[PDB]
Every structure is written in C-alpha cells, then in structure tokens.
Amino acid sequence: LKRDKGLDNTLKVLKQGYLYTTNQRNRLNTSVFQTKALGGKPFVVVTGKEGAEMFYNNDVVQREGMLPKRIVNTLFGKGAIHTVDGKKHVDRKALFMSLMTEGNLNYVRELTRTLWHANTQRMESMDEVNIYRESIVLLTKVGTRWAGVQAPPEDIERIATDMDIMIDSFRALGGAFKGYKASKEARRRVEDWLEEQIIETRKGNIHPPEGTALYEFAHWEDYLGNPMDSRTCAIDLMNTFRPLIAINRFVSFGLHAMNENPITREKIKSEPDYAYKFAQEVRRYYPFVPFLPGKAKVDIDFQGVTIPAGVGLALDVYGTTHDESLWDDPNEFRPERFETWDGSPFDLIPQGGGDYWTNHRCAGEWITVIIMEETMKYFAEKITYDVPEQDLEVDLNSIPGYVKSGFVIKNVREVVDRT
Numbered sequence: 001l002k003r004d005k006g007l008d009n010t011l012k013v014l015k016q017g018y019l020y021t022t023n024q025r026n027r028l029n030t031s032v033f034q035t036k037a038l039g040g041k042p043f044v045v046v047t048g049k050e051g052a053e054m055f056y057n058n059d060v061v062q063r064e065g066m067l068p069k070r071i072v073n074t075l076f077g078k079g080a081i082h083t084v085d086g087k088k089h090v091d092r093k094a095l096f097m098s099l100m101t102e103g104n105l106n107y108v109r110e111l112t113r114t115l116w117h118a119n120t121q122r123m124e125s126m127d128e129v130n131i132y133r134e135s136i137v138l139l140t141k142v143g144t145r146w147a148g149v150q151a152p153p154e155d156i157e158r159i160a161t162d163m164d165i166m167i168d169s170f171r172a173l174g175g176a177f178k179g180y181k182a183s184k185e186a187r188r189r190v191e192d193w194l195e196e197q198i199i200e201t202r203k204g205n206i207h208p209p210e211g212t213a214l215y216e217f218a219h220w221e222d223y224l225g226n227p228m229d230s231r232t233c234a235i236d237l238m239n240t241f242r243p244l245i246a247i248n249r250f251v252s253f254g255l256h257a258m259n260e261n262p263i264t265r266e267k268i269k270s271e272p273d274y275a276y277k278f279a280q281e282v283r284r285y286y287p288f289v290p291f292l293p294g295k296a297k298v299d300i301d302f303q304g305v306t307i308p309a310g311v312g313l314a315l316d317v318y319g320t321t322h323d324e325s326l327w328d329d330p331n332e333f334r335p336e337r338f339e340t341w342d343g344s345p346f347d348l349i350p351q352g353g354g355d356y357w358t359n360h361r362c363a364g365e366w367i368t369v370i371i372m373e374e375t376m377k378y379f380a381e382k383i384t385y386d387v388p389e390q391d392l393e394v395d396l397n398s399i400p401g402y403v404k405s406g407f408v409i410k411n412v413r414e415v416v417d418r419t
C-alpha cells in the first residue's frame with residue numbers, strides 16, 4: 001500500500017486542491033494510496049467505479065463519526081442525517097426521499113422557471129449582474145418556498161448570505177480558518193429561525209402545506225415512534241434547502257461553460273433533450289465536492305492491497321468524475337457524452353454514489369438537475385447579455401471551486417418577438 005508520506009498532509013491537500021489525489025496516483029504509479037490528514041489520521045484514497053462500489057458497501061465501510069467536527073459544526077449541523085448510520089439513518093433518509101415525489105419535483109421546476117422569468121426586469125436594470133450572487137438570492141426564494149418555509153422578501157438577502165458562508169465552510173477540510181466563527185454564527189441564526197418555525201408548526205400557530213419539508217419534518221416520527229428534538233429537526237430541515245441554494249455554484253459554472261462553448265447555447269434552444277445533458281456535464285466536469293470520508297470496519301482486499309480495519313477511507317469524487325477510463329477526454333466539456341451514459345450509480349458521483357435509500361447519497365440530485373435545466377434554458381433563450389472582461393479562472397488547486405469573478409454579466413435584455 002503506497003504512501004504519500006508525512007505526519008500530516010492536510011496543507012499539501014489544500015495547496016493541490018481538486019488535483020491532489022490525481023497528482024499522487026500519477027506520482028506513486030497506483031490507483032490506491034494512503035495519506036495522513038486531519039491531524040495524523042491515515043486515509044486510503046479510492047477512486048473509479050470500483051472505488052465507489054466498495055465505499056458504499058455498508059457491511060465494510062462506516063461513515064458515522066468520520067466528517068471532521070468543524071464541518072459538522074458549520075456545513076451540516078450537529079446530529080444531521082449526514083452523521084448517523086444504520087437503522088436510525090435508513091429511517092430518517094426515508095423522510096428526505098419522501099419529499100422527492102413527481103409533484104414536488106415539478107413544483108420545484110415551476111418555481112425556478114417562474115422566478116427567473118419574473119426577474120428579468122430587475123436584471124435589465126442593473127449595470128452588471130454577478131450571477132453567483134443573483135442566483136443564490138433567487139434560489140433562496142425557490143428553496144425556502146419549496147420547503148414550506150415562508151421567508152419575507154425583506155429577509156432574503158440576509159438568509160442567502162448566511163447560506164453562502166455555510167456552504168463554503170468546507171474550504172479548510174475541517175481545519176481552523178479565519179471565517180470559521182462567522183460560519184458558526186450564520187448557522188446559529190438559521191437554526192434558530194427554522195427551530196422557531198418547527199416549534200410553531202407543532203403548536204399549530206402556523207400552517208405549512210402537507211407534503212412540504214417544514215410540515216413533514218415537524219410531524220415526523222422515527223422508527224421508535226419519537227419525533228426529532230426541535231433543534232435537530234431544524235438542522236435537518238435546513239438540509240432540505242441549503243444545498244438547493246448551493247446550486248448557485250453550478251448556475252455560475254453553467255454560464256462559464258455556455259460562454260466558453262457558445263455552441264452549447266444554440267443546442268440548448270434547438271434540442272429539448274440537451275438542457276438535461278448540459279446540466280449533467282456541469283455537475284461532472286466542474287469541481288465542487290473533492291472527496292468523502294469513511295472508515296474500514298474490517299480489512300478490505302481492494303486493487304491488490306489490504307485496507308486494514310480502522311483505517312480511514314476517502315472516496316475521490318473529483319477523481320472519479322474525471323477518470324479517463326470512465327469518460328473519453330474527461331477534461332473536455334462535452335454534454336453529448338450523456339447520450340450514451342448508462343445511468344450507472346458509481347461513475348457520475350459528484351453528489352455521491354450508491355443507493356439513495358440505503359447509503360448517504362445526495363437526496364437532491366433530481367432537484368439539482370431539474371433546477372439547472374430550467375436555469376440554463378432561461379439564460380440560453382429568454383435573455384441576451386454581454387460578458388465583460390473579468391477573471392473567469394476556475395482554479396483547480398483551490399477548494400472550493402468558484403469562478404473567480406462569480407461570473408458577471410451586463411446589458412441584459414429580454415428576448416421578445418414583438419412582430
């Protein structure tokens with residue numbers, strides 16, 4: 001079992017970012033390697049379809065307790081679905097997935113579309129529109145409402161900003177960083193606010209619609225017949241739309257891709273299939289989630305080595321979505337590749353792999369793809385705009401993946417036939 005030796009390589013991981021794992025595999029001449037990180041802890045990094053299958057074998061791999069505490073404290077929340085395994089988890093996961101009905105999915109499609117269409121005058125009005133900001137604000141409205149949480153217009157900028165600080169909070173992979181305390185306070189504000197809405201739903205003082213996150217989560221009972229304590233229920237209710245709001249990352253990359261590859265825009269208009277393909281390729285191609293931590297429950301024999309009981313595991317997400325034996329020219333933006341993709345649950349894993357119900361795979365993959373479809377169709381078809389000179393670098397050596405400028409646009413003008 002090959003090592004990238006060192007007492008702790010955390011700072012090295014942060015310096016190489018999304019290309020750390022690839023650089024070590026290339027340099028050590030192997031598909032599997034160990035590295036100590038997060039304070040002396042050894043992690044075996046596994047990749048590919050074969051890495052993803054094993055990583056989501058629940059007989060062999062534990063997730064419970066393997067997220068760094070600082071990331072639990074800021075991104076996901078204490079006691080979040082992300083932090084439990086086994087029966088307790090499968091039961092709770094069922095609640096999340098129960099929101100993802102055909103009707104709720106069309107509802108998020110319709111909200112996203114209507115708000116974009118409604119937001120054109122405002123965007124014509126601005127000297128310039130930062131798409132990272134503008135989309136996070138617009139998706140805060142979609143996401144609160146989709147979750148049955150009433151958020152006043154007056155409060156959406158504040159809320160959006162608190163979400164942004166949280167979503168970003170994995171940048172130090174669990175280390176100390178200067179924005180950490182601000183991250184914890186944004187979460188506290190958002191948790192208090194959702195806890196209030198839960199307590200008040202349970203008292204019958206407010207009335208979220210049947211089938212919304214707020215309603216289902218407030219009234220749900222676990223497999224022992226106990227409801228979630230109010231705080232944990234607010235934490236998990238957030239886990240139902242903070243990540244929806246975080247799609248702003250992908251809206252921004254979306255516009256970068258369409259701008260770099262202007263051909264994609266025409267095909268978004270010409271081919272009703274293509275918006276789906278484009279959205280999938282934005283998720284595969286661009287960096288967001290670097291890797292996921294787990295731990296070996298027992299020795300595992302994998303790719304000619306033994307992973308010892310107790311060692312850490314890191315499923316390489318960016319590595320698997322850019323694996324040259326899974327995708328021809330993994331570093332070329334090419335939506336048409338998804339004409340052939342067979343729907344495998346172990347290659348396209350930018351929001352996790354495996355099974356929605358039994359593993360920790362993202363609950364909101366279909367919402368992510370739906371929202372990106374409607375957003376990209378909006379930007380391709382209903383408006384024209386200019387892209388001024390700006391820093392459009394996406395630095396693959398810096399976690400998290402952002403377009404440096406946020407992706408700024410000007411001279412927005414609705415596309416209308418007036419003849």
Ligand code: HEM
Nearest residue numbers: 081082239240243244246247289351352360361362363364
């Ligand atoms: C926008 C970009 C998004 C990204 C990059 C993302 C990524 C991820 C990743 C990597 C995981 C963990 C996979 C694992 O632990 O094996 C995850 C889990 C999760 N995702 Fe997302 N997701 C996004 C959007 C969403 C949306 C829109 C929702 C809900 C509407 C959502 C809900 C969740 C939940 C509740 C979990 C934890 C599931 C569990 O622990 O069983 N995500 N996501």
Ligand SMILES: CCCCCCCCCCCCCCCCCCCC(=O)O
Nearest residue numbers: 037043167170173242243246291293314
């Ligand atoms: C090479 C490695 C050693 C491994 C170190 C383990 C690092 C653990 C950090 C895991 C990163 C999780 C990032 C998840 C992205 C969050 C989803 C965005 C949507 C949301 O929840 O808001």
